[PDB]
């Protein structure tokens, strides 16, 4: 499957789109995919559209983004028995993948998979009570006060980034853990679904700050800067693989990384239009060893 895309440096220098060109040439026989959808989506032409770009060339797999996401978003610690049952709670997971021409010594492919905040979200269509809806800004809104179980958002999520509170996973009795909880993020109860929110505590705080500055200066229009929102995973990434910013702002770093030819989204045949796109890993092999 075309999940971890690997390229070489010299052919990247010749043409940076050749990874996607070779993938779609092997899959469909054409250089570009003519993915057609029956749903219009929303517009996103003059508004703050938020997206993520994860660099697979610059990810080592140190799990610092995962621990930062847990610390920021109050993700519960479940037991070893609960992980053995398959019910780990992590809004971002680092997927090691062992791809190689010999599996007794393969190449290690680490990739952070969080919620893509898909513009046409299969998790959003199958929610019977509109507990997961989409923003004007372009974020999937997992509402826990509204979520009533039914566990279907997770079955229609193609990446399975959504984590369900099967039991009372969050601690209710330890006062030290209660102090450790973030006051600006909710603490989830048993029976609700949770997933990555692009750190919407920080998104909402910077939007409120920008609107307050706009009305204090009389500008009548709020502008959110490129460095104004920095999510927990992007902040605690020691490599800078994760970058967060505005899509519609062309001068933003995320739009400049998404204008690159090796930027791609996972499972594009499902017309989701992911906002967490990935940059393909570009290797630099030596001619005396590999080439």
């Amino acid at each position: 499957r075309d999940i971890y895309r690997v390229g070489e440096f010299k052919k990247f220098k010749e043409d940076p789109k050749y990874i996607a060109k070779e993938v779609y040439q092997e899959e469909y026989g054409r250089e570009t995919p003519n993915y057609q959808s029956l749903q219009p989506g929303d517009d996103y032409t003059g508004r703050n559209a938020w997206g993520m770009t994860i660099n697979l060339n610059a990810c080592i797999g140190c799990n610092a983004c995962v621990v930062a996401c847990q610390a920021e978003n109050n993700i519960a610690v479940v037991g070893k028995d609960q992980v053995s049952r398959g019910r780990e709670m992590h809004w971002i997971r680092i997927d090691r993948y062992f791809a190689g021409e010999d599996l007794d010594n393969p190449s290690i492919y680490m990739m952070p998979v969080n919620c893509m905040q898909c513009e046409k979200a299969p998790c959003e269509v199958v929610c019977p009570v509109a507990a997961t809806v989409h923003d004007y800004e372009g974020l999937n809104n997992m509402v826990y006060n509204r979520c009533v179980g039914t566990k279907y958002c997770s079955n229609n999520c193609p990446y399975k980034v959504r984590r369900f509170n099967f039991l009372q996973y969050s601690d209710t009795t330890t006062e030290t853990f209660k102090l450790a909880f973030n006051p600006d993020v909710t603490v989830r109860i048993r029976g609700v679904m949770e997933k990555c929110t692009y750190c919407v505590q920080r998104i909402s705080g910077a939007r409120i700050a920008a609107k307050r500055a706009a009305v204090q200066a009389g500008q009548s229009s709020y502008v959110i800067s490129d460095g104004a929102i920095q999510t927990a995973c992007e902040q605690a990434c020691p490599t800078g693989a994760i970058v967060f910013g505005d899509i519609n702002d062309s001068n933003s770093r995320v739009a400049k990384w998404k204008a690159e030819g090796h930027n791609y989204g996972l499972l594009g045949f499902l017309n989701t239009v992911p906002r967490t796109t990935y940059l393909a890993r570009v290797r630099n092999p030596s001619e005396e060893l590999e080439k």
Binding site: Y28, Q36, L270, N271
Partner: protein, 397 residues
Amino acid sequence: IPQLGQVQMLGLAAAVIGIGVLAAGYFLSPTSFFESYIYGYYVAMTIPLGCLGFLMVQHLTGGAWGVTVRRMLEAGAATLPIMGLLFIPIALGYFDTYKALGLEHPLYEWANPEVVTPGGAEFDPIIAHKVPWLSPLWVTARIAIFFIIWSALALTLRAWSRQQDAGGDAKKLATRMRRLSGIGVALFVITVTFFSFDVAMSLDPHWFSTIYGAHYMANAGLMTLAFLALMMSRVRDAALFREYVSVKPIHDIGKLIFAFTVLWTYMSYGQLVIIWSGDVAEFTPWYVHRTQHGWVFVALALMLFAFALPFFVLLFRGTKRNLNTLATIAGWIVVMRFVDMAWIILPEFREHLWDIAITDVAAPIGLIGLVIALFAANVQQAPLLPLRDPNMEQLQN
């Protein structure tokens, strides 16, 4: 016999007109001749396949409508060897003899060596993946086997019915055709589904649907049910249906037509809502092609005149108890089935609503005129109802 001769000469004249206009259009566009002939074959196969299907359904589940229309179903299903003879232009279209017939690139996408072989000009990998199954030899063998199955089934059922009419035990020569119908319903379902696959869905191998074929079964059933209503209105004064046939077979036929109009819009809407709600790019180009360039108007006309009008005019008791109103509704229904097969097949060739040629209306009209003439000639050879049948008591009501 006078009305049978009248509809026989009407179908002969319509067949002559359709074949003449189709042959005139062949000299201006030999590609579109065969593209319209595929659609005409798909339209004209709705009658004999549906006649064989309801012949086996009424044999399994006996009824007053079944013994009323049973000989018409036998006459319609006996035209299937001639339909096997008429599949030969499509087979010659997708064979290697396409160059000698004026058609420049082969009739189906999997008959292209440049598509199904590696190193070719196009080399579509999905169509090249289906290269044994979607090949001219395998498709011709499958459709010929299907013709053999249909022909043997219909000829055996018709021969057993004629033997029951002529000489023999009526009760003993009913269990035999009931058992043959019991195995033949399953054989018919899988055979017609794979025939509909290899004829219609094999035009575009990028898109697959599993409710297809059974949707074609519902389409063919509604088409031949409205056909049965029209012919039953035509032969209502024939000195055999005046004595033994009352308004209850007409009521049952109208109820079956209403039920399978609901069934056809069910099989269309289920596929539509599945592909629409599950937004997968392997399936959505079908409805993109069936919506773009004015085809949304034909889809809305199918919503309004193929479901919303017959659902409301067939919901009343008096409109199906009357043969004149049932025949008018059946004529509107077969017009809407022509429009429905147009909306299903013609987006694969034309790409636009205004790109429809006159061959696209000449081929199904002429070929269904051939179907009309063959059915009338077959029903002229037999009495219109099985007098020596155990289920004759169901006509007394």
